[PDB]
Design a protein around this ligand. Structure first.
Ligand SMILES: O=C(O)CNC(=O)C(=O)O
Ligand SMILES: [Mg+2]
Ligand code: NI
Ligand SMILES: [Zn+2]
Length: 331
């Protein structure tokens, strides 16, 4: 069995290996990369996502989200308070302001310590989930707007044609902006490219141990757990590495820098934070190996998780028993 300790693997494809996206994912899995839940891919030196980032300031963040925390430093939830629209240039200036800018620090580890000590005492503003792409149309390799669609994969594997579309999303971050512990919708893969700016630190639980993290979360968030049998689908709960170590939960950590891709694998729980002003692009995708995970994915039916149009068909075809209850949650 490859990668039996479930370590995060880092890959350096050549320009020739970067041509065929599906084939490279399957290669990484042949080496055990999925066992970690997360892998890093450093593009060949010849590759670029676009020519420059000099002309992005007029992108609109229609609904910036202020991430307000409650709890204790290592165990907290966050809610998202909607703020007035602002452009990317306005948001960058805000991120760089004395109130929001990254503090002086020695290295990534010192910054990680400061994040976990102090996060809860501040409310950073995140431009998340903005439909669009920063890949140049002429970039043919690993262009997250040109991937094979999940609807086409389901049709190729299972024969059933379904409605829905699959497009990428932009994230504009600042110091302390936070992504809560989650797996993807329908336990899909994700791919995330950090286009510019400061790093993103990730934490991940191996898929084979995801139920250990769920059982800890039910203990640490007991009201939320009574409200919903899949409350981590709400994407609001944070648990620190120190607390994970105290409770014996297997995990790994890694820092992504600008110009690097991260892939999350089916049922790989992940969480993390941004070091400073940055912009990332991400999308979900599927492979043949996903289908079995999609069929077994938990679902939120309490009303909180509310998701895209395209998840309807996935539930309807892969989980027909759950469909009626899940759809009530959506309505
Ligand atoms: O970058 C972020 O805020 C969150 N991204 C992801 O959870 C991802 O790419 O799967
Ligand atoms: Mg612009
Ligand atoms: Ni994710
Ligand atoms: Zn729920």
């Amino acid at each position: 069995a490859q990668n039996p300790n479930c370590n995060i693997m880092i890959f350096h494809p050549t320009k020739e290996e970067f041509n065929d996206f599906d084939k490279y994912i399957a290669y990484m899995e042949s080496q055990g990369a999925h066992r970690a839940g997360l892998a890093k891919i450093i593009p060949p030196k010849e590759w670029k996502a676009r020519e420059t980032y000099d002309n992005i300031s007029e992108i609109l963040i229609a609904t910036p989200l202020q991430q307000v925390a409650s709890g204790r430093a290592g165990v907290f939830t966050q809610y998202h308070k909607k703020k007035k629209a602002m452009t990317v240039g306005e948001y960058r200036h805000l991120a760089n302001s004395k109130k929001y800018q990254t503090p002086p620090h020695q290295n990534f580890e010192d910054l990680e310590r400061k994040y976990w000590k102090n996060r809860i005492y501040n409310s950073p503003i995140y431009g998340a989930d903005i439909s669009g792409s920063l890949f140049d149309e002429n970039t043919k390799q690993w262009n997250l707007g040109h991937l094979g669609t999940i609807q086409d994969l389901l049709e190729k594997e299972c024969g059933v044609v379904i409605e829905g579309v699959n497009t990428p999303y932009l994230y504009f971050g600042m110091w302390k902006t936070t992504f809560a512990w989650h797996t993807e919708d329908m336990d899909l893969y994700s791919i995330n490219y950090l286009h510019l700016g400061e790093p993103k630190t990730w934490y991940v639980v191996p898929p084979e141990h995801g139920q250990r993290l769920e059982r800890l979360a039910r203990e640490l968030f007991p009201g939320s757990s009574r409200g919903c049998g899949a409350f981590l689908r709400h994407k609001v709960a944070l648990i620190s590495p120190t607390v994970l170590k105290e409770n014996g939960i297997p995990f790994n950590r890694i820092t992504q820098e600008a110009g690097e891709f991260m892939v999350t694998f089916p049922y790989g729980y992940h969480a993390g934070f941004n070091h400073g002003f940055n912009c990332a692009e991400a999308i979900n995708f599927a492979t043949p190996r996903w289908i079995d995970y999609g069929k077994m994915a938990s679902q939120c039916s309490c009303g909180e998780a509310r998701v895209t149009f395209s998840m309807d068909a996935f539930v309807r075809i892969l989980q027909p028993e759950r469909y009626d209850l899940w759809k009530r949650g959506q309505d």
